[PDB]
Amino acid sequence: TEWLLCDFHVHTNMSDGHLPLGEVVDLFGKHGVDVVSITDHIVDRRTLEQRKRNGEPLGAITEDKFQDYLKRLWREQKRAWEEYGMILIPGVEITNNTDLYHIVAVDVKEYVDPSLPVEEIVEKLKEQNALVIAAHPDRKKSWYLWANMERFKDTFDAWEIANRDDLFNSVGVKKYRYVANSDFHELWHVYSWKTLVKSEKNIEAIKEAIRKNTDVAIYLMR
């Protein structure tokens, strides 16, 4: 148990990030991040239909391609560790823009339908032994999770107290479990709030530490 520097909320050009996967990994690696999770979007049916219909980019990984996406991430787990000694964790951002809940899942193994109820999503993810975080809308951007915090008090392993360069006081004031991430899309988003966690350097230990949340701090990388 030393303190690890972590970012659990990062996107690539596979969903709506600006950057190649390899680049993202290199950028976090060379900035000395110890743990990164790639969390590209999967998106509710209705939103995907709407986008197809308007000729917009999907900015999501489709259900058909989800396993290929994970395969891209497993291969990067190897290179991340070898080149940087960094733990890369395959994840996903479950993105329901119809009812407005974004859920970040870390150490995901199967696709989960973003159109499912919050609680059913979280149970499906806990059946995969995934860490489950309530993502906070970034400042640049009424959100269901955040409007119904008490309802979801024992639902999430952690809530985003910080995102990009912003702190959200509601999580701390309630004394809820917390993490802080970049919500990375653009090169300059590597400089953000991050999570510092006291943990053995392995994925089960890390998920356990965030879940306990007693040795978790937030840290502004500048």
Using rule CB under 5 A, residue 134 touches Cl ion = no
Using rule CB under 5 A, residue 106 touches Cl ion = no
**Among a copy of itself, Zn ion, Cl ion, none, what binds residue 202 when CB lies within 5 to 8 Å by partner kind?**
Cl ion
Shortest spacing between CB 14 and a copy of itself, in angstroms: 9
**Contact at 8 Å (CB) between 7 and 183?**
no
Using rule CB under 5 A, residue 138 touches Zn ion = yes
| Structure-token pair, residue 197 | 């966690």
Give Cβ neighbours of residue 98 (< 8 Å, ≥ 6 apart).
44, 46, 47, 115
Nearer to a copy of itself, 71 or 151 (CB): 151
Give Cβ neighbours of residue 194 (< 8 Å, ≥ 6 apart).
5, 6, 7, 33, 180, 181, 182, 218, 219, 220, 221
| Contacting residue, 40, 157, 160, 183, with Zn ion by CB under 5 A | 183
Shortest spacing between CB 220 and Cl ion, in angstroms: 18
Nearer to Cl ion, 135 or 158 (CB): 135
Q: Is 12 helix (H, G, I), strand (E, B) or coil?
A: coil
Using rule CB under 8 A, residue 220 touches a copy of itself = yes
Q: For the purposes of burial, counting CB atoms within 10 Å of the CB of 104, is it exposed (0-12), middle (13-18) or buried (19 or more)?
A: buried
Distance CA 134, CA 113 (A): 16
| Contacting residue, 6, 25, 203, 206, with Cl ion by CB under 5 A | 203
| Contacting residue, 196, 205, 208, 212, with a copy of itself by CB under 8 A | 196
Q: Is 7 annotated as a binding residue?
A: no
Distance CA 22, CA 58 (A): 21
Sequence letter at residue 168:
F
Using rule CB under 8 A, residue 54 touches a copy of itself = yes
Show binding-site residues for Zn(2+). Answer: 9, 11, 16, 41, 93, 102, 138, 183, 185
Contacts with Zn ion, residue ranges (CB under 5 A): 11, 16, 93, 102, 138, 183
Contacts with Cl ion, residue ranges (CB under 5 A): 102, 135, 183, 202-203
